[PDB]
Amino acid sequence: MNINEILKKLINKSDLEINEAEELAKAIIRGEVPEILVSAILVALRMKGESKNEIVGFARAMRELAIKIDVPNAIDTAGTGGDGLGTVNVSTASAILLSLVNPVAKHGNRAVSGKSGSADVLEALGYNIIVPPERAKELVNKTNFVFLFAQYYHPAMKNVANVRKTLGIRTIFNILGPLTNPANAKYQLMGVFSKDHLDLLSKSAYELDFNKIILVYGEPGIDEVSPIGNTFMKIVSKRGIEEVKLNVTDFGISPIPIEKLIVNSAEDSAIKIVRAFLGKDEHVAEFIKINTAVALFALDRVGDFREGYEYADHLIEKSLDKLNEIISMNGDVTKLKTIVVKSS
């Protein structure tokens, strides 16, 4: 693996082979490549426009270097993020409903834009987001749910922290985290932030070896099933990549005004979700349920999205309690009660 040959190759706008990319990624994440060259590379890759092999290459590298646990049968609902509209922490909430009928390995980080980060609500809720791997497995067995805090499950990325911060621009590492679930979940719902990444990441995904992963991009430009209108999807499986366009009305609901689904703090997000669980905020609930319906489909638990939406209705009614047993086994329920009160 010659750093120079690689760089010159990217500069000429030639895509790498999966293996070149993986060795390249491996060197960078290991800390064996001078910052000047990591910067050059990340910048070259972006201006060339990353290709499938490249994504595949880097993903495989990151999985390899990441702290792992084995729960392939699990499902994750992490999205790439980056839309920055501060919407409520949907997929996290949605991860609570899923754990009721299937092991859930929720991968995520704290907020980058705003403060509605997956790891932040869980914290605001009473959950102890920093879980050691040996414990992580125990929890998923006892409660069917664990949150895998990325910073900690991908310690190696520390060797790229300075370049990324100094560069202060989006790079290939901004859309890779969801393809790197630390527990190797084979089923997942991952939202991307642009129609273009929907095409690239689904093609990449097709080779990262999932049983079923559903990539989505919903209007007005968030990485979720769209709560106001259309949702562009890609259902990936050993069979291929299926294209599917969906409107929020297909779930049998009227479009939800998005201002209703936007938060301004972690606690505010937590309250939105509990109130949703408690039936005191139909809007957030419909948002949590349209996302869960797509996840449920990924698991092959329903025949269509409507069935998925109705089924999700039965899950949300048991989620508050579910949330309580999960947080009791790994956190502080008094914080959950406080949040509950704060929403009654």
Residues annotated in a binding site: 77-79, 82-83, 87, 89-92, 106-114, 118, 164, 223-224
Binding flag, residue 312, ligand PRP (CB under 6 A): no
For 18, 49, 138, 153, 211, the CA distances from 70, given in Å and listed in that order, are 25, 33, 11, 13, 15
- Residue at shortest CB range from ligand PRP: 79
Nearer to ligand PRP, 222 or 285 (CB): 222
- Using CB under 6 A as the binding rule, whether residue 182 contacts ligand PRP is answered as no
Residues 185-204 touching Mg ion, rule: CB under 5 A, are 191
HSE of 99, CA atoms in CB hemisphere, 13 A: 29
Burial 300-327 (b: 16+ CB within 10 A, else e): eebeebeebbebbeebbbebbebbbebb
Structure token digits, residue 162 = 């300075």
Q: Is 311 helix (H, G, I), strand (E, B) or coil?
A: helix
- By the rule CB under 5 A, 269 interacts with Mg ion: no
Point out which residues bind its own copies (CB under 8 A).
3-4, 7-8, 11, 13, 34-40, 42-44, 46-48, 162-163, 166-169
By the rule CB under 5 A, 91 interacts with Mg ion: yes
- The amino acid sitting at 176 is L
- From its own copies, ligand PRP, Mg ion, none, which one binds at residue 39 (CB under 5 to 8 Å depending on kind)? its own copies
Cβ proximity to Mg ion: between 227 and 308 the closer is 227
Binds ligand PRP (CB under 6 A): choice among 51, 77, 144, 159: 77
Q: Are 263 and 88 in contact (CB under 8 A)?
A: yes
**Smallest distance from the beta carbon of 1 to its own copies, in angstroms?**
14
Backbone angles phi, psi at 54, to 5 degrees: -60, -50
Residue 19 interaction partner, one of its own copies, ligand PRP, Mg ion, none, beta carbon < 5-8 Å per kind: none
As annotated, the binding site for anthranilate includes 79, 109, 164
167 φ/ψ angles, rounded to the nearest 5 degrees = -70, -30
User: Closer CB to Mg ion, residue 28 or residue 200?
Assistant: 200
CB of 8 to its own copies, least distance (A): 6
How many of the chain's residues bind ligand PRP (CB under 6 A)?
17
Q: Residues annotated in the binding site for Mg(2+), as ranges?
A: 91, 223-224
Estimate the crossing angle of helix 118-125 against helix 90-98, to 10 degrees.
Answer: 60
Backbone phi and psi for residue 240, each to the nearest 5 degrees, phi listed first = 140, -170
Instruction: Report the run of H or E that residue 188 belongs to, with start and end.
Output: strand 187-191
- Tell me which residues touch ligand PRP (CB under 6 A): 77-79, 81, 83, 85, 87, 89-92, 108, 118, 191, 222-224
